[model samples]
Target: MISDEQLNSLAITFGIVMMTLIDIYHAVDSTMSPKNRLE
Candidate 1:
């Protein structure tokens, strides 16, 4: 059986990573979009 402390830590890390990736994806998308970049 897994411990609650380990599970909590892992979940927090996963959540942070997912949000960071999403933030980066949006940043890159806005920076690279043709309309946004050229307009």
Candidate 2:
């Protein structure tokens, strides 16, 4: 029973969090050697 505005806000928040996590992972990966990179 969520309102449209609330749902939209939640979606945006989730998207931002996901993107942030991806950016952080890439940054960390780029700093590591190929062998140490996350599989």
Candidate 3:
């Protein structure tokens, strides 16, 4: 069986990856839209 510490570390890593993907998704979404675009 795995230790609690290892599980916690994996959870934390997963959370960060999810958040990064979400941020990137939104960034791409804005670029695709005309109103939200910077230019």
Per-prediction TM-score, please?
0.67, 0.69, 0.65
Residue lDDT tens for model 1, 1-39 = 899999999999999999999999988987887363443
TM value for model 3: 0.65
Model 2: weakest 10-residue lDDT segment is: 30-39
1 versus 3: better TM-score goes to: 1
In candidate 2, position 39 carries an lDDT of 69
Report residue 17 deviation for candidate 2 (angstroms).
1.0
lDDT (10s digit) by residue, model 2, range 1-39: 899999999999999999999998987887783465366
Q: Which candidate order results from sorting by TM-score in descending order? A: 2, 1, 3
Candidate 2 residue-wise lDDT at 38: 64
Residue-wise lDDT of candidate 3 within 1-39, one digit each (tens)?
A: 999999999999999999999989987987786473356
Of 1 and 2, the candidate ranking higher by TM-score: 2
Q: Model 1, stretches more than 4 Å misplaced?
A: 34-39
Candidates' C-alpha lDDT: 0.89, 0.88, 0.88
